[PDB]
Write a protein that binds this ligand. Sequence first.
Ligand SMILES: CCOc1ncc(F)cc1-c1c(C(=O)O)[nH]c2c(C(C)C)cccc12
Ligand SMILES: [Zn+2]
Ligand SMILES: [Zn+2]
Length: 232
Amino acid sequence: SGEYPTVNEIPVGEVRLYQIADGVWSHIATQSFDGAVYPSNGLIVRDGDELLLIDTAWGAKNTAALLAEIEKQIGLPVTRAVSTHFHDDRVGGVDVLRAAGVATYASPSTRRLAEAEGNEIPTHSLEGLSSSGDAVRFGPVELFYPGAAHSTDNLVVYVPSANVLYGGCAVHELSSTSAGNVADADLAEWPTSVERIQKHYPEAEVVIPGHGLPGGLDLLQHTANVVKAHKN
Ligand SMILES: CCOc1ncc(F)cc1-c1c(C(=O)O)[nH]c2c(C(C)C)cccc12
Ligand SMILES: [Zn+2]
Ligand SMILES: [Zn+2]
């Protein structure tokens, strides 16, 4: 009923959308992994009479449900998708997208890591993102590579029309007390990568983490703090 969706308010197998700004939504879904249940976020950005999708809904059936929820709530076609790193909460569902005619994209780094992991692999490679601080335009967003953080390949996404910063899994929600799933992280580089985000996007009004509740710019410093304490 208008609050940011959580596992307790998303019916089983379902996806919810949340309006972030004009022409910007997040998508929220639930998945189990190693016997625990987690929410995860992605983004939807209106691109004229089409939609750009950022990240899958973490799984094939969740991603099919995402497409249905978009049709119900928005009614514009998803034409392109970008995955912001190689983990299954970002690429799991890419095959569903591709069979629904969505063109799927990721950096070459992400595509290599996904292939090596046995995860689904986006079709198209996003060049121009291989050095930290790199940025490229992609429809109504800017893609930015801040350096290694949650993963070596993680990308962040900025929606300039709305000053929305989608941090993905490099950014944690304010209530978080741990650095999440760090198996592929660089805890030493992570603060430096966050500082790059902070420097590059000082006008961000909304910051969206990969998992949990959106907030403001404070999510960035909070993330650096949680990571530093995990590392120690
Ligand atoms: C093990 C604890 O993990 C988390 N704890 C709290 C969170 F808010 C997020 C995660 C989490 C993340 C992430 O931190 O991005 N990624 C995950 C994955 C990927 C590899 C598919 C699986 C299971 C959990 C997570
Ligand atoms: Zn991840
Ligand atoms: Zn994640």
